[PDB]
Amino acid sequence: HHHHTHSVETPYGSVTFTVYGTPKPKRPAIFTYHDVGLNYKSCFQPLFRFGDMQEIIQNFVRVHVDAPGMEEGAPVFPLGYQYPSLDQLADMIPCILQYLNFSTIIGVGVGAGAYILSRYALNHPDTVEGLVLINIDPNAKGWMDWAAHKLTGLTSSIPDMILGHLFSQEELSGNSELIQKYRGIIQHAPNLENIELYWNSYNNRRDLNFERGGETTLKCPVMLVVGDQAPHEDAVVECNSKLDPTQTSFLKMADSGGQPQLTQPGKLTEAFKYFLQG
Numbered sequence: 037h038h039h040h041t042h043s044v045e046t047p048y049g050s051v052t053f054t055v056y057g058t059p060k061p062k063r064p065a066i067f068t069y070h071d072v073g074l075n076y077k078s079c080f081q082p083l084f085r086f087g088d089m090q091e092i093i094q095n096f097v098r099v100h101v102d103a104p105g106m107e108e109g110a111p112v113f114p115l116g117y118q119y120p121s122l123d124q125l126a127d128m129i130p131c132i133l134q135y136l137n138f139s140t141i142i143g144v145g146v147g148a149g150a151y152i153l154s155r156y157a158l159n160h161p162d163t164v165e166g167l168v169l170i171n172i173d174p175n176a177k178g179w180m181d182w183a184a185h186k187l188t189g190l191t192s193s194i195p196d197m198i199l200g201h202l203f204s205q206e207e208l209s210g211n212s213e214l215i216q217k218y219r220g221i222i223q224h225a226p227n228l229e230n231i232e233l234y235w236n237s238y239n240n241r242r243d244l245n246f247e248r249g250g251e252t253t254l255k256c257p258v259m260l261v262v263g264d265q266a267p268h269e270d271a272v273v274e275c276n277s278k279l280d281p282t283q284t285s286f287l288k289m290a291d292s293g294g295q296p297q298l299t300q301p302g303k304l305t306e307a308f309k310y311f312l313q314g
């Protein structure tokens with residue numbers, strides 16, 4: 037698993053990205069963006085290093101983004117630091133791609149990462165050959181979503197609420213080895229204060245429109261993924277109703293829970309194969 041790690045300076049701060057494999061003339065880069073509370077390794081290593089996935093992605097160059105302050109070893113931003121909005125995080129992507137001189141990507145995002153890459157694709161559609169969107173929720177919180185959030189926050193800590201964004205309450209109750217591991221990752225994150233600022237940016241996101249005036253806005257192939265009964269199911273189901281069905285696939289996974297790329301890498305690998313196959 038040899039790689040090389042870079043960053044770029046942008047008007048909204050520095051962002052880190054890690055490159056595996058080598059670029060090739062025909063082919064897009066697989067470009068990933070992780071969810072709140074994770075980084076590229078805790079979000080994507082279990083999938084990307086799954087043996088059957090290694091086979092599928094070996095000949096692609098992979099560019100794995102760590103959002104600002106989420107990279108391994110990140111300093112904790114001083115309290116008061118104004119963290120980029122999700123839109124601003126999407127606006128850093130052209131800098132990364134310009135630095136690498138990679139003109140085309142297949143974006144793979146989870147949660148907030150899926151929003152960010154969707155925003156990027158709307159901004160620069162001629163650079164995106166497809167998107168894999170896990171747990172995408174493109175809607176801003178309304179008054180009532182804020183009400184629910186704030187009420188929950190009376191009895192839940194920030195880390196509790198981030199774990200509830202990532203996993204179903206049923207999973208969190210069941211103390212599987214995975215959940216125990218990820219509880220520790222989030223609760224005890226040395227950069228938890230940074231993670232919280234990314235959480236806030238996610239919660240404050242504006243509407244991202246996959247349709248306008250009843251017409252779909254995204255023009256690339258999209259593979260939607262969510263767990264059945266998982267926190268973001270209704271949002272992903274709604275996205276599926278707004279995208280062009282001739283260019284869209286939707287895996288609602290029966291037994292995946294909130295982070296399907298962590299629990300069902302075998303099933304997701306076969307999905308990835310058919311998404312990338314020529």
Ligand SMILES: [Mg+2]
Nearest residue numbers: 159160161162
């Ligand atoms: Mg353009």
Ligand SMILES: [Mg+2]
Nearest residue numbers: 243244245247
């Ligand atoms: Mg709308």
